[model samples]
Target chain A: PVTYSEPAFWCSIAYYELNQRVGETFHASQPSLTVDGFTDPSNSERFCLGLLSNVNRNATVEMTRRHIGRGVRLYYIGGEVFAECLSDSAIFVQSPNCNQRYGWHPATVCKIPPGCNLKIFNNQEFAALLAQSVNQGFEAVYQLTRMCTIRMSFVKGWGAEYRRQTVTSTPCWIELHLNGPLQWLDKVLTQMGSPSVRCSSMS
Target chain B: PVTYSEPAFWCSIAYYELNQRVGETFHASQPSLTVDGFTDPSNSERFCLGLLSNVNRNATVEMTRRHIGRGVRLYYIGGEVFAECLSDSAIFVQSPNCNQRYGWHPATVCKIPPGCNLKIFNNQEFAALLAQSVNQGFEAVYQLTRMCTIRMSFVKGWGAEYRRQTVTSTPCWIELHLNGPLQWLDKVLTQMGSPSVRCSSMS
Candidate 1:
């Protein structure tokens, strides 16, 4: 008798056509370092000033690097948060919890956060930033870890209504799967936060 | 403006539980050549028989191949015929073309062909044949084809009940899709009398 086992690595790439207003927002803290006080280069009294300044600058730089790292981490975490929030809302729409229920049904009211105002930034730039941030975060966590490769190119789009915002971040989504060396990517992504990740396997 | 095209290939595999009855005596004409006539010392005789004989034996053998190829072709054509006949009967059961009506409710009868019995075969074996035939047929027809592979595997039971006799062929239903190479393969199968082929552009 011949027996077959599931493939060692199985993953898929899918494109989800999002609803008109459905999108995600990613936020990160600014880096801690700044260039300050470099013009006064010659005073004996300034030696102490210079020493403290140098120390502060170094500390700031270190803080900035840490913040940027945290920002990248937060972006992914935010995506997970949004996906969970959306899915939970969908479930609630179908079967509402008494406490969460209101006069309007959950499905009818679950709109993208209005706080995701796109009027603050340029549309093209914002879309590019979204693509870059998602790509960077995914790479740091998966590609850099030598766990998986991006089988498809990253894509980003903004809501048509948000074409006028400054410092704009478009609502975004990422489609990916864990395969090959990074077969455990899903587990890793799901385990990032305390909330359980909801994934529907395709047959 | 950014526009994206679907990848060249996408695939899905499905397994149908099949139950088939010998509806009427389905007589496959005797082969012009037989396996015993082959002079080759090797089992090359298996491949050397007349087209019809080769098809019959190959259909049985190909039914077992782990992957797609020539034998799968015959099995798909055979299955198509089986499904069409079954569907026709199902339709007839609900709306019999038996009598005429004038301001009167028409009468109908549910009938199963006599001397027919249904049987179920190995799900995996059935799927293998389907996959092979679809893939082969697709490959033969499409130009600049992007390959996608879809397979159907039996996950549950398939059998037939007869009014008077034991059903010989098990009835099964399977649905699957392939992108790229598999799409082309499907085209080839369609050309060879398998008319269940469908095409869609993935978004």
Candidate 2:
């Protein structure tokens, strides 16, 4: 008999049009993943963000062409997920854990201009946020801890600086929903007597 | 008869050794300010960060020497305060509005590595954060809106990745209290029907 290990995924990326998610979700089982506008059918790494305009019909041709010029490369290194911007259009990243650990007030967005990189997610930070929320006992904190996700947008950025109020208002964006990281955080938090997890176990 | 305008400061920076603020606060009335370790008695721009070790007496010579290498250049550009890292050692910035506007959960810190620049403050984003907190009606929100501060560390970093728990735990750090910006935000929020301000008015 041969023993095989289950494929572990770090994150799942999906395209979202407004409030609805468009296209298939890409499960990142590997340590690195590249999301690009390379339209070649043979290129497995291409997220084919150019096709988003076709699916939505709301995005203009000129806008999509510039927005997805090259796209972004993601690396899960040292328990932290980093985003390297390869596109001509600047990218925006909103990491729940990164925001909370740094004490951002409400809905702050980090802009990664062309040729720059940002540490979008850190496991240690996420765990720390979870541990802090454990004592707070706010239902809102529970929801925040469960949704271990990093939201990224291409070209059009959102928040107070821009006219668009939220990422949903942006034309092109991807959501990297981290399942494995969240599970790992949950396990760690459980050992630390995380009330958020304790409540779930009781329910 | 001569007409004169009152001194208008965009930001204020003060040294904090652990929890205690040391020395006098530097009111940045100009559009730009440079902070360095230059021991020159006549250099007005020099915050003389090197002198911090002498005052604290707890900081090691080697640590303080390397931490204040060249220091940082700050500019108030287009209603945003940007910090250009001129130091050999990396600096950590904690912008309250920047974190909140992007949806950071609790306490998130942004590391401005050597040679990189970061926008630490935006008037628009601060105003937006204040406007949103108006509806929540949390007493905590009032305090948060009132502070409008940005905390930065010199060399030693803090939070989840580092051994130190908070900025206060770090050996050397500066607090940019942003009193002027906070007053501006309060005025904007009051115009937007901020309940936080309304509660303050009643009291």
- The most accurate candidate by TM-score is 2
| Per-residue accuracy of model 2 over B93-180 as CA lDDT, tens digit each | 8776677667774478888999999887788876666667656653334345324567778777888788887877776677675645
Kindly list the per-residue Cα lDDT of model 1 for residues A51-162, writing each as its tens digit: 1111112332222111111010101221111111211011000111111224333212122221221111122332333334344554333332221212111112132232
DockQ of each: 0.01, 0.01
Residues B103-190, candidate 1, lDDT per residue (tens digit)? 2122322232322312111233334444564555423322112112111211111122333121112222223222223322323332
After TM-score superposition, the amount by which residue A75's alpha carbon in candidate 1 deviates from its true location, in angstroms, is 24
Error of model 1, residue B111, in angstroms: 11
Model 2 chain A is weakest, by summed lDDT over 10 consecutive residues, at A48-57
Across all models, the iRMS values in order are 31.1, 26.5
